[PDB]
């Protein structure tokens, strides 16, 4: 049994809370990484101090 | 040259500063022409004398 508090499987709560569990087979869900990845590092003048932002 | 470099700073306070510009000038270099009036060395002057034109 795998323990995960994934807010995708409360879903609910008080006396409505509904807790799912998933019964899997190998290969039964499957997540691939597009490796397209992209991070910008901006920055603006004109005032006091440089500001950034990512 | 740019007169404003150095700005007193205020890490805790986000202001807006006005910008400045970067200025170019020109040195200069007058040309100026000089010469000598015709001069008359005639041969014959010379030779009267004997001498060496």
Same mark, same amino acid.
């Given at each position: 049994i795998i323990i995960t508090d994934s807010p995708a499987l409360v879903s609910g $709560? $008080?006396?409505?809370?509904r807790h799912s569990t998933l019964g899997l087979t190998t290969g039964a869900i499957l997540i691939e990484q597009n490796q397209d990845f992209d991070s910008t590092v901006v920055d603006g003048t004109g005032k006091q101090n440089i500001t950034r932002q990512y | 040259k740019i007169q404003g470099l150095v700005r007193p700073r205020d890490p805790y306070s986000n202001a807006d500063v006005a910008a400045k510009d970067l200025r170019q000038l020109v040195d200069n270099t007058i040309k100026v022409a000089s010469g000598t009036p015709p001069i008359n060395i005639p041969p014959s002057m010379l030779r009267w004398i004997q001498k060496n034109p």
């Amino acid at each position: 049994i795998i323990i995960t508090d994934s807010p995708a499987l409360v879903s609910g $709560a $008080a006396e409505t809370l509904r807790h799912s569990t998933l019964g899997l087979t190998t290969g039964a869900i499957l997540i691939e990484q597009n490796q397209d990845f992209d991070s910008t590092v901006v920055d603006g003048t004109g005032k006091q101090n440089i500001t950034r932002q990512y | 040259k740019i007169q404003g470099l150095v700005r007193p700073r205020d890490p805790y306070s986000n202001a807006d500063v006005a910008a400045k510009d970067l200025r170019q000038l020109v040195d200069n270099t007058i040309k100026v022409a000089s010469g000598t009036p015709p001069i008359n060395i005639p041969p014959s002057m010379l030779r009267w004398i004997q001498k060496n034109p």
